[PDB]
Amino acid sequence: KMEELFKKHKIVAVLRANSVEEAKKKALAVFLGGVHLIEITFTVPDADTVIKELSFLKEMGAIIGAGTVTSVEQARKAVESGAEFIVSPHLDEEISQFAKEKGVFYMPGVMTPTELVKAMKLGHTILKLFPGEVVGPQFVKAMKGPFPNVKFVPTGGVNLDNVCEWFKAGVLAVGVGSALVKGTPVEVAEKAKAFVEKIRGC
């Protein structure tokens, strides 16, 4: 499921907006840009309500899932409001077991090999390289040797100049944020079409 969706689409989107309207406007803008994967991070107030309202974009063909889920109650709200996947910045055994029971694709974040191996010993083989500005481009490549069976989703410090410089190193789907979602929807929606063409280029 989610694994092959990620492999096929090749980009996610982490939306951080302050109102509960500018969320919907930028969700629509990125959709028209070409991005079918949308992540509603719970820093947006009533982000469960925002997912519930964007429900109609699942019909047109988008994928709406939570983000920055740091507690079991937040995971409860996300899975109730129809989020298709969960994303946290840190490992959480409790959230992992809950998502295992409920059958929801959970994608924890890892920074160092101890965290990484603690993850792999629990089942999640592809994780979130938070942050890909500190750890860098040469961490996933330098760590293909020891572990060649894990694939990363480098959510941090991603832009035009090094968007497929991480695809060359073997990442799945570079989750992007503030490079996209910044400005009027007519610019958010036109600047997503420059990442999607560049990812589809390399």
Side-chain angles (χ1 to χ4, degrees), residues 3-202:
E3 309 163 348
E4 76 259 18
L5 282 71
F6 272 88
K7 295 146 191 51
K8 158 168 194 171
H9 283 94
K10 275 179 151 195
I11 181 169
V12 216
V14 234
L15 258 358
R16 227 130 27 209
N18 44 18
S19 34
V20 180
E21 186 295 323
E22 207 52 34
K24 283 184 302 310
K25 252 55 190 166
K26 280 157 170 187
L28 290 169
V30 299
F31 194 110
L32 307 177
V35 169
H36 294 248
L37 289 152
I38 296 155
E39 182 182 301
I40 299 289
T41 50
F42 280 27
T43 60
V44 188
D46 303 319
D48 70 325
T49 301
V50 169
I51 309 151
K52 171 173 61 181
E53 289 183 354
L54 277 296
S55 82
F56 63 83
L57 263 184
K58 305 190 49 165
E59 298 174 351
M60 281 185 58
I63 294 93
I64 315 295
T68 312
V69 176
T70 305
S71 79
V72 188
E73 290 81 3
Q74 290 193 343
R76 204 62 31 91
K77 289 181 197 173
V79 65
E80 278 179 7
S81 283
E84 302 152 78
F85 63 105
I86 311 296
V87 166
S88 60
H90 68 112
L91 320 172
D92 205 297
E93 191 274 330
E94 190 68 27
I95 295 168
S96 190
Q97 73 64 50
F98 174 82
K100 185 74 69 178
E101 292 176 11
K102 209 66 79 170
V104 187
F105 172 76
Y106 166 44
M107 187 172 57
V110 295
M111 183 177 177
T112 51
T114 308
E115 278 186 333
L116 199 154
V117 174
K118 180 67 174 66
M120 293 177 70
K121 299 294 184 289
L122 269 293
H124 315 268
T125 179
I126 50 149
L127 354 101
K128 188 182 176 186
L129 192 67
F130 190 37
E133 42 175 10
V134 166
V135 308
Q138 64 262 359
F139 166 83
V140 64
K141 161 146 61 52
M143 207 213 86
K144 299 289 94 176
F147 311 88
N149 60 6
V150 292
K151 308 169 293 299
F152 290 128
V153 177
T155 62
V158 176
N159 58 5
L160 281 193
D161 317 317
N162 61 99
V163 58
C164 65
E165 277 49 43
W166 293 354
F167 278 119
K168 173 264 293 178
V171 299
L172 291 179
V174 295
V176 185
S178 102
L180 253 43
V181 190
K182 210 63 62 195
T184 182
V186 182
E187 291 168 353
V188 165
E190 188 267 299
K191 188 159 59 183
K193 178 221 192 172
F195 287 174
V196 70
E197 277 190 339
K198 181 69 75 68
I199 291 173
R200 179 198 297 161
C202 311

